[PDB]
Each structure stands twice: as C-alpha cells, then as structure tokens.
C-alpha cells in the first residue's frame, strides 16, 4: 500500500487533493467550536 499510494500518474495530484481535504477538515472544527461558543 506504500507503492499503491506512491505509484500513480502524478501522485502529486493525489497529495494536493489530500492536502486540500485535510486542511479544510482542520478548518471545520474551528467554526464548530466557535458556533458552540456562540
């Protein structure tokens, strides 16, 4: 699964998409906690 993830046409694209997804998931609970406060 190391090669399966790493070996892809421009896994770079895979990594970029994963980065976007992870970062936005990180964005979420900030507004979650702020809404809970409010």
């Amino acid at each position: 699964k190391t090669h399966g993830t790493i070996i892809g046409v421009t896994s770079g694209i895979v990594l970029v998409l994963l980065i976007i997804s992870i970062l936005v998931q990180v964005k979420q609970p900030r507004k979650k906690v702020m809404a809970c406060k409010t």
């Binding site: 998409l17 976007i20 997804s21 936005v24 998931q25 979420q28 979650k32």
Partner: protein, 253 residues
C-alpha cells in the same frame, strides 16, 4: 469492485471528502441559513445553523450512498452545491451499473467451442494426439474433409505440438490450449477423476473391444453368447462404475 477501476475509487474518496467539507464551509458562513428553533417561536434571537460535521459528512455519505439524508439546504450556494453532489453521485452510480451489466451480458453471451468441425475452422486452439496411437493414423487415412484438414493441420505442426506420451499432452492441455485427441475410455476415466477437465463433442470413431482367438477356438461362439448375456445383464456397467466412477465419483467436483 472489478467493474470500476481502482483509479476512480480514490477519486470517489477525495471527491466525497471535498464535497462534504466545501458544502459545510459554504453553509456555515452564510447569512440566511440561521433559523429560529422553537415551533411556536415568537420571533426569538436564537437563530443558528444546525449543520455539524456529522450532519454534512453523512449527508454526503447518504447521497453518495444513493439515499436522501435529512437537513435540506436553504441558501443558494449550499443548495446548488448539494445539487451538484446529487448529480455527481447519480451519474457515477448509473455508469457503474452500466458497466457491470456490460460485463455480465458480455460473459453470458460467450460460446465455448463444442464441435470437432468447429475446431477445424479454428486455428489458435491447437489440436493434438499421441501420434501413431492409431488416432492420428485415422486422420491420415480419413476421408471426411473435416478430418482431412485436421490431419493437414497435424502434418502442418509436423510434431511441433504433437506429443508421444499421453500424460504429457494431458499436462499440455492443463497448461495451454491443446486438444490431444485420444480414445473415449481414457477420456471418461481421467475426466471423472480430474479437475478442470471435460469431455467435448461426440465420438468421431467406432472402434470395438473384443477377444482375440485363432480361427479354431471353441470358445468363440460360446463367449459371444456369454458376452451378450453379461451386456444384457449389464454387469459391465457396474464394472465400469467400479473402475471409472467408483474412483471418479469420490474424486468428482
């Protein structure tokens, strides 16, 4: 998972995650979306969105999962995005069923080779036989145009495919596309006691199993009568069972 290549599956993963997160980050930051909780809400000051990670995450999970979830969107942006999500999942799964139907049909409509002449027309599948096992000899001296061209193909390989040893052609068939035309009895014996193997077609020839005697043998007519008795009885049937299927059936798939 076969009818959809594992080049899309991770794309489902990433696309779902993106749709869910983006639709939430659109929906939370919107001025309309906040709403009054109470049923007989007398214009309170507690309007707020309901959406939580769990609410939107499995909103995507259900929509992708081909089932309407709860929490209808309200704002223009969230509603259009969720519509796009609905559209995406619909088109994907419809395509999915399409391709799987493609496989099932195309497999169902295949036809396995059955006829000796059907193999005559064929070229890739290789005919075979233990040469000089009285079989290919009949092909040499066959008169039917089919059998004639099988013998022509045999001569064409010129022993390149022809084998001299039954079991060796057996393994060749096990491992390659080989016919190894032999006699019926060994066919039945092996097939009933083997895996992956099949009797194919009918019977080309009509050889007979008899008893050899000199011109003067008193037992000739007597034994003709005796064998007509046994075959009338059919004890030979149970004998064939004993030595062909008595091992065939327990070793039968």
């Amino acid at each position: 998972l076969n009818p959809l290549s594992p080049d899309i599956w991770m794309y489902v993963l990433l696309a779902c995650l993106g749709v869910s997160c983006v639709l939430f980050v659109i929906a939370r930051f919107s001025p309309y979306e906040w709403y009054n909780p109470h049923p007989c809400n007398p214009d309170s000051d507690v309007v707020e969105n309901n959406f939580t990670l769990l609410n939107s995450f499995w909103f995507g999970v259900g929509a992708l999962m081909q089932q309407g979830s709860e929490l209808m969107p309200k704002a223009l942006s969230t509603r259009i995005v969720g519509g796009i999500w609905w559209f995406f999942t619909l088109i994907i799964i419809s395509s999915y069923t399409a391709n799987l139907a493609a496989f099932l049909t195309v497999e169902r409509m295949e036809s396995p080779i059955d006829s000796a002449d059907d193999l005559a027309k064929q070229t890739k599948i290789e005919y075979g036989a233990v040469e000089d096992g009285a079989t290919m000899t009949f092909f040499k001296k066959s008169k039917i145009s089919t059998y004639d061209k099988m013998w022509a193909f045999m001569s064409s390989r010129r022993q390149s495919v022809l084998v001299k040893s039954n079991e060796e052609g057996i393994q060749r068939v096990l491992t390659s596309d080989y016919a190894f035309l032999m006699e019926s009895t060994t066919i039945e014996f092996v097939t009933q006691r083997n895996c992956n193997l099949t009797q194919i077609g009918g019977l080309i020839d009509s050889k007979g199993y008899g008893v050899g005697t000199p011109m003067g043998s008193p037992y000739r007519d007597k034994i003709t009568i005796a064998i007509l008795q046994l075959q009338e009885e059919g004890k030979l049937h149970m004998m064939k069972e004993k030595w062909w299927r008595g091992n065939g059936c327990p070793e039968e798939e």
